[PDB]
Design a protein around this nucleic acid. Structure first.
Lengths: 197, 127, 172, 51, 106, 61, 50
RNA sequence: AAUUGUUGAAAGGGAAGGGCAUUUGAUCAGACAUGGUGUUUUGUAU
RNA sequence: AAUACUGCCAGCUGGGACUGAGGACUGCGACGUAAGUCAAGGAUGCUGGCAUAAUGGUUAUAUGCCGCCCGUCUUGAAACA
RNA sequence: AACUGGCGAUGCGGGAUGAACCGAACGUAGAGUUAAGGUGCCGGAAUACACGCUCAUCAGACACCACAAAAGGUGUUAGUU
RNA sequence: CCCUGAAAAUGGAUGGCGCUCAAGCGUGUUACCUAUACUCUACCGUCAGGGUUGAUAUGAUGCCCUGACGAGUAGGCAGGCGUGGAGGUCAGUGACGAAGCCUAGACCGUAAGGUCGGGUCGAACGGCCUCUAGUGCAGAUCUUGGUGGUAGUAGCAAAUAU
RNA sequence: UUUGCUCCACACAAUAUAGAUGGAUACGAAUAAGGCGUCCUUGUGGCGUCGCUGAACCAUAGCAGGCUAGCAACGGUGCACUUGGCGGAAAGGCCUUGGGUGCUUGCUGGCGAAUUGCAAUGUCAUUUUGCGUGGGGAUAAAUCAUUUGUAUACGACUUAGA
């Protein structure tokens, strides 16, 4: 329904988000994944760290420079997770991975555009309450991502920049809803409502 | 034109080229069955060339028929073309390659006189 | 095959000139249809009496429907099974609405807990608990409390589209 | 030349089975039944409902 | 108006395929917001046009088109099998075909 | 697939026409084929089948 | 390489005369007919009915 | 012919080549444009 | 008493897809008092555009999937035979 | 070594892969329905439904098959006396 | 069920990614996906059973009807294509161009192959019926000849020296 | 280097398409909780409401969108201008003063539409150059060759030279 969608990565499980995103990428959809810091992996944090180290110590023996490039940024973690879910080697897979753009935090111009969430990939709707979870923000800092603090400050600034945006949007929405009430209970709206709206 | 005929369909238009005929130059394009004990072309593996079979045999009612709906006929002399006087709807004339230019003009003149379509009328045109 | 029906299967030895009219045994079988009813009848009858389907005959197969199929009632199900390293018997309380649903839930829960398939479960007896104050399982006595009340926190709503524009809540 | 299917194509369904027209006219496949006030034995229903 | 779409869009998903064999003769189309087979039953028989742009004018238009029809539903997700006079180029996996409302039924 | 109860495409194992090239024998067969086709008498059905026999199977009488 | 008949036009006139006269009574229908039809987004023709 | 040059065409992210199908480009034959339900031969076969 | 379940209809009907095989008639049958008509031993009717590179063919390329290097010896070959 | 079925001599769908296993054996095409196997994505197919069990600081994931035992655990869920 | 027991050497394998009221385990309900399988149809081939001659069909190993089948190495048989040469015929073709050769140009045949168009060339060569054989090549560390990559590379550095 | 280069305008052609055909419509945090509105003895507050899907909200009528007239009014919405700003995470976009201008379907009129003939996407987008029409803007470097050695097999590196 949408030309390009911006997926908020907050509160999503890595695998269940990545699967639906990989399907939508192949179907010809354009998706930009933001807030990859808060992307969640189900289960114990230390277990996830050990799993990552299992992967991490696994490199081309004769020349480490060409082995599996163990990316540390949360965006590249999620993007590697989405690879493998896409036949990346072929040209169609290459096109899909071109149609994918993963971003730490919310860079412009996706900062001023509507973000979307995948309801059935969510931690809230997929993890039974009580089962603890692992978040890429701390996992990546534990594995080598050396930019959490600056990402933290940039998001601190983006929260206030968007907070004033909503502060004025709420006021305008309130005044337009109040004007809707003012112009309501007239014939044009009264019989429109019974007409269906 | 010819008599009405069923719709033409080859059922295999692509030629059946011999295996490895491009990988090697000595292997001619003419089809030869791969008769080896290892050969995946003989064992009919998926994703390999399909050998000619009788199942590809064209419809009998449309065999030897050109798209124009005629059976070809090598005509060499005018007397040969006099054979197809009343069978213009079945056999189409065709000048043999070794017919000289001066002898092709007379044959095409008799061809239009007899009303037989010729499938190489622009051959060895004298100009 | 878990969608069940109770059938009463009545059957007997082949009548003979020496002894006619055999005793005409009968039992209540939980089965997906009449064919599995016949099969389970002969199985549970071989394990009881010297008779085989070749040497016997089935006189009737009547579906049994509940007297109050929409009334909650507690069931004590004596059930035996064959575990990996021997057999067992036990007695499971179930709180369902019909004997059919009780045995359905029972096979499903036995396969879930003790990993016992149908081929290794024999329902000895499903007796409706006539009154309370005798069920010995806390997981049923907790639903026999007065003013049985409990909420349902964290409702998950199934979605229709891959994309939702509201960050769904979960109140309920 | 071509195997037309009965059970449809009423023309063939009448070429075979001439009784088909009477069957369709008098609805022999959808025949109403009578009513009988027969009650099963109390002993038999007690056997069914017991235990 | 500013919207002249008289068709419903559709993503040409892929060829009718097995795990490792595809049949180019049959394509698989997905309609937006159609996710159930009874809903996609309406779209059967509808015409599908794959409208693509050619590098050159051929018969008075730079815009070429491959025609097809919706054959049958596919899966439980409202995906529909489609068939064209000439099969889709296998490069258009994820391209926008147009499903018109004719032949109309309602 | 089909369980071939017996060998498939098993030819009759009999002669349909003489293997010989004799035009007059072919004419006799052309005639008795017409007779065996158009007469109930089995005498034609047997003389026709005997006209195909080889030299060893047609001993002098 | 490459006007309308003077007989079609008067039949058109006399027929849409009656159609217009019929249509004037019911509200909004004439400009409803003038408006073209199109498919918006967020529309589902498989359940939309006309 | 192998092989080579020049020119022209195209393709080339650790091969090339092949099959199925289509796109795209290049190129290629066919129709039906039939003595034709006839319609005055300009001192009667267009 | 219904309704659910199972089953039946030589019940009706809506929509979709692929195929049109053969080429005088015969036959079987249905409806019509009959004449004849017909969904009855296989597609006809109307209409439209184009009449050519439009369809199609070949070839090159791209794409989706598949595709191991042939001959032989061998129970077994893509083989590091 | 015995009975049978297969591979050899055999492709095809599934077992990621494989001569033997499961399904099923093959003229060329079309349409439908399926088998084995599956239905998050790669990947065609329900992130379908239902009941439970399990949290592993080396989970488990499907026959042939590609690994695991004795013993032990107020870890937890059922149960018997 | 899980945990301990549970340690092998390149990095790495439920196939991978990932998966935690699972995308795990046990179990069940349906729906759905797809084999060259099954059903129907068309076509090809083989086989089998048949139809076809009182002035009617090119005059019959022919035409047609019906039905079923079609995997396959070793191997068997049948029908054909092609090369060299012989007998016959087409009163065949040809210096206005035979043969030969090239042709991501065309047609026919399932195929072996045939035919046609274009370019070179310059003197013989075809179809059919039959006969005959030194008759068909991708292999034989095959023979002879030629030509490549390697490769403008190794090398042309003993003997003092221009 | 046939007045070169580049940018703003317009045109013309190609080639170019991983795929426009109303609007990416912007809080954050939690989910055993939240959003909104009011209120107050401003706080982790009171009250009320909402959710249970985006199936929403906006927009959406007109020769593919003409011509024209009026009515109610000070709105909406392009187009540019301009006031100011704010935005560096890949800012390149958002807000806003004001006036001009086009449209206005908010309401009522009138005229036109045809023959593309019963469908043939019936073309309308976004990229990149290249010849051009006319305005602005500026008027170099690098490589070889020579040479130094902080360098070096050759390249490279580091130099120097009007």
């Amino acid at each position: 329904v949408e030309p390009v969608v911006v997926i908020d990565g907050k509160g999503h499980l890595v695998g269940r988000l990545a699967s639906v995103v990989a399907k939508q990428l192949l179907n010809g959809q354009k998706i930009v994944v933001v807030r990859a810091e808060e992307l969640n992996i189900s289960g114990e944090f230390f277990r996830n760290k050990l799993k990552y180290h299992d992967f991490l110590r696994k490199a081309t023996a004769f020349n480490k420079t060409r082995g599996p490039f163990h990316f540390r940024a949360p965006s590249r973690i999620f993007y590697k997770a989405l690879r493998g879910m896409v036949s990346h080697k072929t040209a169609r897979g290459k096109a899909a991975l071109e149609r994918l753009k993963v971003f730490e935090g919310i860079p412009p111009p996706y900062d001023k555009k509507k973000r979307v969430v995948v309801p059935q990939a969510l931690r809230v709707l997929r993890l039974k309450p009580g089962r603890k979870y692992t978040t890429l923000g701390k996992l990546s800092t534990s594995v080598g991502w050396k930019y959490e603090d600056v990402v933290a400050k940039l998001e601190a600034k983006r929260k206030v920049s968007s907070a004033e945006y909503y502060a004025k949007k709420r006021a305008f929405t309130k005044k337009v809803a109040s004007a809707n009430a003012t112009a309501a209970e007239s014939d044009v709206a009264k019989q429109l409502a019974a007409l269906g709206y | 034109a010819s008599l009405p005929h069923p719709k033409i369909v080859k059922k295999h238009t692509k030629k059946f080229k011999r295996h490895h005929s491009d990988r090697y130059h000595r292997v001619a394009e003419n089809w030869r069955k791969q008769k080896g004990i290892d050969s995946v072309v003989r064992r009919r593996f998926r994703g390999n060339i399909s050998q000619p079979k009788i199942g590809y045999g064209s419809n009998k009612k449309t065999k030897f028929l050109s798209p124009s709906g005629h059976k070809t006929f090598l005509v060499a002399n005018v007397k040969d073309l006099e054979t197809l006087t009343m069978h213009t709807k079945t056999y189409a004339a065709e000048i043999a390659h070794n017919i000289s230019a001066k002898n092709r003009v007379v044959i095409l003149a008799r061809a239009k006189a007899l009303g037989i379509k010729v499938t190489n009328p622009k051959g060895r045109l004298a100009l | 095959m878990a969608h069940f029906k109770e059938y009463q299967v009545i059957g007997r030895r082949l009548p003979t000139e020496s002894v006619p009219e055999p005793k005409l045994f009968r039992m209540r079988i939980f089965a997906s249809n009449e064919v599995i009813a016949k099969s389970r009848y002969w199985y549970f009858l071989q394990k009881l009496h010297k008779v085989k389907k070749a040497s016997g005959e089935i006189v009737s197969i009547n579906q049994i429907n509940e007297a109050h199929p929409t009334k909650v009632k507690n069931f004590g199900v004596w059930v035996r099974y064959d575990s990996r390293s021997g057999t067992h018997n036990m007695y499971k309380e179930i709180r369902d609405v019909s004997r059919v649903a009780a045995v359905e839930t029972l096979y499903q829960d036995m396969a879930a807990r003790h990993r016992a398939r149908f081929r290794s479960i024999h329902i000895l007896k499903v007796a409706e608990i006539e009154k309370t104050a005798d069920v010995k399982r806390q997981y049923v006595k907790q639903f026999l409390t007065k003013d049985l009340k409990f909420p349902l926190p964290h409702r998950v709503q199934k979605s229709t589209k891959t994309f939702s524009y509201k960050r769904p809540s979960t109140f309920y | 030349v071509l195997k037309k299917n009965p059970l449809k194509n009423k023309q063939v369904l009448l070429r075979l089975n001439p009784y088909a027209k009477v069957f369709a006219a008098e609805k022999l496949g959808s025949k109403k039944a009578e009513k009988t006030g027969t009650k099963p034995a109390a002993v038999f229903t007690e056997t069914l409902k017991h235990d | 108006a500013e919207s002249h779409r008289l068709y419903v869009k559709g993503k040409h998903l892929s060829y009718q395929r097995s795990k490792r064999v595809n049949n180019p003769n049959v394509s698989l189309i997905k309609i937006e917001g159609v996710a159930t087979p009874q809903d996609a039953q309406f779209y059967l028989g509808k015409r599908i046009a794959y409208v693509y742009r050619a590098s050159k004018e051929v018969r008075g238009s730079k815009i070429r088109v491959m025609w097809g029809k919706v054959t049958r539903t596919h899966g439980n997700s409202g995906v529909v099998r489609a068939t064209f006079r000439n099969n889709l180029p296998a490069k258009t996996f994820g391209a926008s075909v147009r499903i018109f409302l004719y032949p109309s039924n309602i | 697939g089909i369980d071939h109860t017996s060998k498939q495409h098993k030819r009759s194992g009999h002669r349909t026409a003489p293997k010989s090239d004799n035009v007059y024998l072919k004419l006799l067969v052309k005639l008795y084929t017409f007779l065996a086709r158009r007469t109930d008498a089995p005498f034609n059905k047997v003389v026709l089948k005997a006209l195909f026999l080889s030299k060893i199977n047609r001993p002098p009488v | 390489a490459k006007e309308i008949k003077a007989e079609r036009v008067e039949d058109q006139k006399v027929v849409d005369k009656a159609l217009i006269a019929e249509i004037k009574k019911t509200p909004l229908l004439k400009q409803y007919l003038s408006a073209s039809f199109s498919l918006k987004n967020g529309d589902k023709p498989h359940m939309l009915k006309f």
